Amino acid sequence: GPVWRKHYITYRINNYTPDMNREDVDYAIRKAFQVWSNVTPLKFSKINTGMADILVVFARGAHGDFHAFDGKGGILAHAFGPGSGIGGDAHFDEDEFWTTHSGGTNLFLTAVHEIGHSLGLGHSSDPKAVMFPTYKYVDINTFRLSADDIRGIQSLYGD
Amino acid sequence: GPVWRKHYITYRINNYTPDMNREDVDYAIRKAFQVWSNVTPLKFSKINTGMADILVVFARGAHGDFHAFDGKGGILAHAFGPGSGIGGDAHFDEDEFWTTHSGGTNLFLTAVHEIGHSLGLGHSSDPKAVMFPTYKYVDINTFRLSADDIRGIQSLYGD
Amino acid sequence: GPVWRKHYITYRINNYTPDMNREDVDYAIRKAFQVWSNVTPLKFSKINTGMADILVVFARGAHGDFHAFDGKGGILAHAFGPGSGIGGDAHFDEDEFWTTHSGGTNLFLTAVHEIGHSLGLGHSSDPKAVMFPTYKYVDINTFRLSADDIRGIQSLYGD
Amino acid sequence: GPVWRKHYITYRINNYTPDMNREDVDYAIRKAFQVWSNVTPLKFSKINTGMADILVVFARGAHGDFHAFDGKGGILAHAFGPGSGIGGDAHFDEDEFWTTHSGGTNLFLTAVHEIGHSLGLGHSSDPKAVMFPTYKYVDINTFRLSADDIRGIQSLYGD
Amino acid sequence: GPVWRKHYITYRINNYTPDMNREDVDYAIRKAFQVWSNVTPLKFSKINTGMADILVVFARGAHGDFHAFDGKGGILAHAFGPGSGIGGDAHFDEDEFWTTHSGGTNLFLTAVHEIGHSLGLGHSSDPKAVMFPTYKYVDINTFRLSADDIRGIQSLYGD
Amino acid sequence: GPVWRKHYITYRINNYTPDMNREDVDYAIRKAFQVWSNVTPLKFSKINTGMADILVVFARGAHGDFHAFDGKGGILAHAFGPGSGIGGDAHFDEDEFWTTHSGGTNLFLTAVHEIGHSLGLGHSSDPKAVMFPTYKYVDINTFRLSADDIRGIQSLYGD
Ligand SMILES: CN1c2ccc([C@H]3CN(Cc4ccccc4)C(=O)CO3)cc2CS1(=O)=O
Ligand SMILES: CN1c2ccc([C@H]3CN(Cc4ccccc4)C(=O)CO3)cc2CS1(=O)=O
Ligand SMILES: CN1c2ccc([C@H]3CN(Cc4ccccc4)C(=O)CO3)cc2CS1(=O)=O
Ligand SMILES: CN1c2ccc([C@H]3CN(Cc4ccccc4)C(=O)CO3)cc2CS1(=O)=O
Ligand SMILES: CN1c2ccc([C@H]3CN(Cc4ccccc4)C(=O)CO3)cc2CS1(=O)=O
Ligand SMILES: CN1c2ccc([C@H]3CN(Cc4ccccc4)C(=O)CO3)cc2CS1(=O)=O
Ligand SMILES: [Ca+2]
Ligand SMILES: [Ca+2]
Ligand SMILES: [Ca+2]
Ligand SMILES: [Ca+2]
Ligand SMILES: [Ca+2]
Ligand SMILES: [Ca+2]
Ligand SMILES: [Ca+2]
Ligand SMILES: [Ca+2]
Ligand SMILES: [Ca+2]
Ligand SMILES: [Ca+2]
Ligand SMILES: [Ca+2]
Ligand SMILES: [Ca+2]
Ligand SMILES: [Ca+2]
Ligand SMILES: [Ca+2]
Ligand SMILES: [Ca+2]
Ligand SMILES: [Ca+2]
Ligand SMILES: [Ca+2]
Ligand SMILES: [Ca+2]
Ligand SMILES: [Ca+2]
Ligand SMILES: [Ca+2]
Ligand SMILES: [Zn+2]
Ligand SMILES: [Zn+2]
Ligand SMILES: [Zn+2]
Ligand SMILES: [Zn+2]
Ligand SMILES: [Zn+2]
Ligand SMILES: [Zn+2]
Ligand SMILES: [Zn+2]
Ligand SMILES: [Zn+2]
Ligand SMILES: [Zn+2]
Ligand SMILES: [Zn+2]
Ligand SMILES: [Zn+2]
Ligand SMILES: [Zn+2]
């Protein structure tokens, strides 16, 4: 339902998980956004000062929004739909072991799903959709949005 | 507790339910606001561009705020008390069948209740209050706030 | 899913609401069960000693099962599906004002819905079904299960 | 609402917290039950084989009933009201540091409160009641039920 | 914490998912139990009449225990720890597409995890444990409990 | 995780509890903030007009954010971590009896804990920490942050 009313959207990485190197996090997040900007007129920019539209946060258990994570495994992250303040923010469960590979939980893949929410997409019932609520590792090189993801995101922002 | 610190309050209809015609939704919502402005110094205006104080959204199940609706029937909608960002926003469960009549769930009647929350009112224990938590259809022509609703809303904004 | 594996089912009224006379409660509950036994091979009997299959309880707020009621209005009651121990038990929110008429919340009508759950039925999306999650008063003399209710209950116990 | 329909009630200690010696746990629990049997016709017996009415369990986080504890501090324990199966069972959050003294969280004091629930008592609004929802250490030698606790428990079992 | 006090444990399949053939369900469930009996003195038997210790149920959304499933994906099932009545029961989200292969959600693999709970095991933080809260398909022929699973289950029942 | 990106932070008292005199509330809150500014470079100012970073609200039960309080005792208050809109806001359960002394629930002590959250601190497992989730009255004259509180708050804002 909720949707951003602009094409230029900014994000800021609030804090970094110690599981990966800082540049690994920056890259994974940037690639995740690119997946969506590739099929829409949306443009994403990372900022280090000022208020960003989408704040990326790594935290475990109770972290300030009354929706605590559950420890290692299970729920991997969550994000608010489009909006001011908390809207669009993406939170990643620090109790997970984030990685750039097939071990632990892949940050890039999870970020794609979460940003889908940040942009206004809900869960899909299509097994192939990145918005399907069940995580399944796939190499980044072969990862691709499903037609369902494309349709949904374009129904909101076009292109 | 929370209360708006101004008399001019704006609202924007984020998206429309397919259950009714667009103008039916605009009218029902406008009439709902008028019910409250009629007994206070508050003034409501609908805007189509810019940030509105109260955003009206139609959505089903999980819709971005971590408080998912429950399908047809039961919870019909929910709204945040006065505040910035999400504050004041009213969400209507799309799984309900919204109408301008006695069938399905009447949008106008439900909107009056929700806006009551948007303005800072909680649930009432008075069976006659629009803020009573149990829905009961009443023709719009004979609908009226109860003394309890009036007292509560005026204790906040006067007039 | 859950279903009783017998036709003779007993119920016991744990405690009585002070809103009505004891015999009014006994009658309303008995009539509610009869609505279901009328369209199935099920037989219900009220017992005053021993362990009943379905325990009827009146309570407010937190009452021992970790699913507290919400005060006057809103959720009126809840019940567990078929099973031993807590299974089948029906709890009625004492914060409601129970009646034998159109005022407050009608016990008989609510009990029919709850017993539907006690017998293994979930919510229906049919507006006419007693299992539809939205309460609407109807005189007992004209009340009747919808075809959807009948089909569902008979798919479980036949007749 | 729920209430036991007998005077002879048995309890069994499912497992022991490593925080205290086994006999310290047995004693604290026995003293907690005695607090209630002292003002009612109820009689409690500890059994080591067979099905007990009240099962005492020490566990952390998610422990099998879908109502997970919250780690050290905060919620200290919880218990189901009178009934078969899970009814009456008392669960103590293992993440707390249980003791026989003023340090950590006193098992005896907490057990008195929990057993109050096991017997059918809800929370009290009386600051002096053991059933008041806020924990406050008091030496066992000077601990005593409040008039509110007495009235409530006797309204259920007399004496 | 909770644990069964016997070696002979029975289970009964309450209802069957239409996703698979009846015999496919019976087999998958039987194999899941065998995984646990292989490393303990426990013995499992399927019964078709009478009260089973562990009831297997397939259901979607709200199904009678006040802990509704969430639709396709996400939470796949849940189960109560050892105990009478509801204790030990395993519920499988019918909104998932259950299979005997790598498509949809594998019943056998999920059942192994759930039965782990039914037997008294909680979630593990070991990525290799079947009790780790994140689902990952693995061919049944190569599936195996992790040392962590073995230790945990044997700490409860030995062998 | 979330953290304020400035040293000058403002707060505004939305409404006052009738339990204490207005000046008692202002003082208790001011002292609570001072506890934190004493060990960091942070500076807090109370404003009466305009948008404050941290809004202090007194409310009971359901109060507009979908996380209702629980009546007298138990949960005493809650607050959102650093952020715009609702971020940082502190809500105090009006069902508690707030005081400047050892009776009821001490506002100052509770406010120190809540502001800890407002500033970005989560719960501590150190029994001596003000951020430990279990309330324990201590005279204001002898109250002091624990080393754990200091370390945590300084890891975020330094000094
Ligand atoms: C790359 N893809 C991802 C990545 C992440 C997620 C979700 C999974 N998840 C688990 C979950 C979701 C919903 C309910 C319970 C558990 C998360 O928390 C957040 O990320 C789902 C999917 C589908 S996929 O195409 O395989
Ligand atoms: C016109 N009036 C309305 C309209 C809407 C509502 C509420 C009912 N509701 C159901 C509910 C509320 C609380 C808890 C459970 C279910 C909603 O969700 C939102 O609207 C209540 C009432 C009382 S009334 O005077 O008859
Ligand atoms: C006679 N009929 C009843 C009686 C009772 C109920 C439900 C309503 N309800 C409110 C509710 C349900 C679900 C979610 C929020 C609120 C209850 O709690 C229990 O009873 C629903 C219906 C449909 S009806 O044909 O009009
Ligand atoms: C000896 N007494 C106890 C012991 C235990 C408890 C409760 C407190 N508690 C915290 C709680 C309760 C409710 C909500 C949040 C937190 C528990 O979990 C279980 O025990 C309350 C009280 C009141 S007292 O007279 O001081
Ligand atoms: C074969 N294995 C299974 C099978 C099932 C499950 C869980 C997963 N799950 C998702 C979940 C769990 C907890 C929280 C959110 C989502 C379930 O619901 C039930 O089954 C976990 C695991 C770990 S594994 O070794 O790969
Ligand atoms: C002065 N100190 C306070 C003040 C307030 C609080 C918390 C307690 N609490 C109860 C609670 C917390 C978490 C879960 C259940 C119950 C609150 O709600 C808010 O304030 C904790 C503590 C630890 S202390 O050093 O003794
Ligand atoms: Ca997790
Ligand atoms: Ca944002
Ligand atoms: Ca981590
Ligand atoms: Ca929330
Ligand atoms: Ca609904
Ligand atoms: Ca708003
Ligand atoms: Ca609709
Ligand atoms: Ca529950
Ligand atoms: Ca109610
Ligand atoms: Ca029962
Ligand atoms: Ca009543
Ligand atoms: Ca705890
Ligand atoms: Ca029991
Ligand atoms: Ca412990
Ligand atoms: Ca699911
Ligand atoms: Ca069972
Ligand atoms: Ca299915
Ligand atoms: Ca409280
Ligand atoms: Ca704020
Ligand atoms: Ca008060
Ligand atoms: Zn979060
Ligand atoms: Zn998601
Ligand atoms: Zn919403
Ligand atoms: Zn409402
Ligand atoms: Zn109940
Ligand atoms: Zn229902
Ligand atoms: Zn428990
Ligand atoms: Zn309690
Ligand atoms: Zn279930
Ligand atoms: Zn699990
Ligand atoms: Zn709040
Ligand atoms: Zn806290």
Distances in Å between the Cα of D86 and the Cα atoms of C62, C76, E13, E127 are 16, 24, 22, 32
Residues C90, C33: Cα–Cα separation, whole Å: 12
The number of residues in chain B equals 159
Chain D residues close to C58, C-beta within 8 Å: 1
With H, G, I as helix, E, B as strand and everything else as coil, classify residue A55.
Answer: strand
Question: Residues, chain F, total?
Answer: 159
For F149, the enclosing helix (H) or strand (E) is: helix F147-157
Classify the C-alpha dihedral D148-D153-D154-D159 as positive or negative.
negative
CA of C21 to the centre of ligand 17 (A): 12
Three-class SS state of E122: coil
Residues in A lying within 8 Å of E, measured between beta carbons:
70-74, 76, 97, 103-105, 123, 125, 127, 132-137
Residue in A114, A118, A119, A121 annotated catalytic? A114
Query: Looking at the annotation, which residues of C are catalytic?
Result: 114
Instruction: Give the largest CA-CA distance in chain F.
Output: 39
Cβ A110 vs Cβ A135: under 8 Å: yes
Copy the structure tokens of residue C75: 């959720």
F123 CA closest ligand 6 atom index: 13
- Amino acid (one-letter) located at C143: F
Residue C57's closest CA among C115, C109, C12?
C12
CB E21 within 8 A of CB E63: no
Neighbours of A17 (CB within 10 A): 21
From residue D5, alpha-carbon distances to B147, C90, D42, F92 in Å are 46, 18, 11, 41
**E80/D58 touch (CB, cutoff 8 Å), yes or no:** no
Secondary structure class of F55 (helix, strand, coil): strand
SS3 F32: helix
Nearest CA in chain B to F90: B2
- In angstroms, rounded to a whole number, what is the distance separating the alpha carbons of residues A29 and D99? 47
Residue F52 to residue F17: CA distance in whole angstroms: 19
Rounded Cα–Cα distance for residues A80 and A68 (Å) = 14
Give yes or no for a contact between C78 and C91, defined as CB atoms under 8 angstroms apart: yes
Catalytic residues of B: 114
**A123 touches ligand 1 (CB under 6 Å):** no
Of C1, C84, C87, the CB nearest to E63: C1
- Residues F44, F106, F112, F114: which is the catalytic one? F114
Residue F44 DSSP label: E
* Cited resolution, angstroms: 2.2
Q: Which amino acid is at F38?
A: N
How was this one solved?
Answer: X-ray
* CA separation for the pair A79, C81 (Å, rounded): 34
Q: Yes or no: say if C71 and C94 are a contact pair by the CB < 8 Å rule.
A: no
Q: How far, in Å, are C42, E34, E150 from residue E39 at the CA level?
A: 44, 9, 7
User: Over the range F24-53, which residues count as b (16 or more CB within 10 Å of their CB) and which as e?
Assistant: bbeebbbbbbebbbebbebebeeeeeeebb
Go through the domains of chain F in sequence order and give each one's CATH number: 1-159 (3.40.390.10)
DSSP strand pairing (C43-46 vs C8-13): parallel
Nearest ligand to the C-alpha atom of residue D74:
6
Which residues sit with Cβ closer than 5 angstroms to ligand 22, an ion? E 87-89
Task: Please report residues of A whose CB lies closer than 8 A to that of F120.
Answer: 64
Distance CA D43, CA F147 (A): 48
Cβ distance of A122 and B86 shorter than 8 Å: no
Separation of B61 CA from ligand 34 center, angstroms? 32
- Cα D148 to Cα C126, D132, D155: the distances in Å are 48, 10, 11
Chain centroid offset of residue F88 CA: 9
Instruction: Report the alpha-carbon distance of residue E153 to residue A91 in Å, rounded.
Output: 34
Instruction: Give F41's DSSP letter.
Output: S
**Can you spell out the DSSP letters for E13-70?**
E----TTS-HHHHHHHHHHHHHHHHTTSS-EEEE-SSS--SEEEEEE-SS-SSS----
8 Å CB contact between C58 and D1: yes
Q: Residues with Cβ < 8 Å from A146, sequence gap 6 or more?
A: A124, A126, A128, A129, A130
C94 belongs to an annotated ligand binding site: yes
Which residues 6+ apart lie within 8 Å of D104 measured at CB?
D19, D96, D97, D98, F127
Question: Residues of E forming the annotated binding site for Ca(2+)?
Answer: 19, 53, 70-71, 73, 75, 85, 87, 89, 93-94, 96
Of F23, F20, F12, nearest to F118 by C-alpha is F12
Taking contacts as CB-CB distances below 8 angstroms, the residues of chain A near F122 are: 61-64
Neighbours of B145 (CB within 10 A): 20
With a 6 Å cutoff on the Cβ, whether F117 touches ligand 6 is: no
Place of tokens 């039965």: E115
Hey, is B9 helix, strand or coil?
strand
Task: State how far the Cα of D83 lies from the Cα of C107, in Å rounded to an integer.
Answer: 24
Query: F109: Cβ below 6 Å to ligand 6?
Result: yes
Q: Check E4, E114, E119, E153 and give the catalytic one.
A: E114
Cβ within 8 Å, pair E133-A74: yes
Instruction: State the helix-helix crossing angle for B107-118 and B22-37, rounded to 10 degrees.
Output: 50
Closest C-alpha among E90, E112, E108, E91 to residue E99: E108
Segment holding B30, helix H or strand E: helix B22-37
- Please give, rounded to a whole number of angstroms, the shortest distance from the CA of E51 to a CA of chain C: 9
Closest CA to A101 of A18, A28, A17: A28
A 10 A CB-CB count for D104 gives: 17
Closest C-alpha to A53, from A86, A79, A93:
A86
Classify residue B69 as exposed, middle or buried by CB count within 10 Å of its CB (0-12, 13-18, 19+). buried
Query: Residue D141 burial by CB count (10 A; 0-12/13-18/19+): exposed, middle or buried?
Result: exposed
Q: What is residue B22's DSSP assignment? A: H
Q: Is D45 helix (H, G, I), strand (E, B) or coil?
A: strand
Contact list in A for residue F87 (CB cut-off 8 A) is 64, 85-86
